[PDB]
Amino acid sequence: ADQLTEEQIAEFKEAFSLFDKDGDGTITTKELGTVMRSLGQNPTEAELQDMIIEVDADGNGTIDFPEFLTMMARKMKDTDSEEEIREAFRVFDKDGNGYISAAELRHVMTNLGEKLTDEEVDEMIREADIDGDGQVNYEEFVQMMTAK
Ligand SMILES: [Ca+2]
Ligand SMILES: [Ca+2]
Ligand SMILES: [Ca+2]
Ligand SMILES: [Ca+2]
């Protein structure tokens, strides 16, 4: 993989402020726990502390913006649940070129009996189409699946 685009760095910077409620430039275990309980997750205080220590090798007690980039780097590692995502992607990506085009999604939708216009499909794709190419990239498909 190459280095992150200036655009990705900007995306992760806004995602950093989404995690950092103070805007002070740091994420603490309290803020980790704030996001966790907003997701309905109830781990122990010790688990939340170790989740900080996993990246806070420097020992200053917080996850700063470069460490947030490291926190994302440890999610760019293959995981078990990714197999289902890869299968679902290949159900829509019928020619296997690494992109789901609106036409390919429409093929599945037409077979389901959905009676949308191309413009209605376009609106659906727009929520995932970050780069504006009219298709869903693999990274964008993760974003598409993280929403509803
Ligand atoms: Ca903070
Ligand atoms: Ca640190
Ligand atoms: Ca395709
Ligand atoms: Ca796209």
Q: Is 93 annotated as a binding residue?
A: yes
Asked if residue 137 lies in contact with residue 98, where contact means CB atoms within 8 angstroms, the answer is: yes
Q: Is 80 annotated as a binding residue?
A: no
Please state the separation of Cα 52 from the chain's center in Å: 20
- Long-range contacts formed by 99-106: CB under 8 A, 24+ apart: 99/133, 99/135, 99/136, 99/137, 99/138, 100/135, 100/136, 100/141, 101/134, 101/135, 101/136, 102/134, 102/135, 105/136
What spacing in Å lies between the alpha carbon of 21 and ligand 4's midpoint?
Answer: 30
| Determination approach | NMR
**Partners of 63 in the beta sheet?**
27
Angle between helices 102-112 and 118-126 (to 10 degrees): 120
* CATH number of the domain residue 27 falls in: 1.10.238.10
Distance, in Å, from the CA atom of 125 to the CA atom of 109, rounded to the nearest integer, reads: 13
Asked if residue 118 lies in contact with residue 102, where contact means CB atoms within 8 angstroms, the answer is: yes
Q: Which domain holds residue 68?
A: 6-74
What spacing in Å lies between the alpha carbon of 102 and ligand 3's midpoint?
Answer: 9
Q: Is 58 annotated as a binding residue?
A: yes
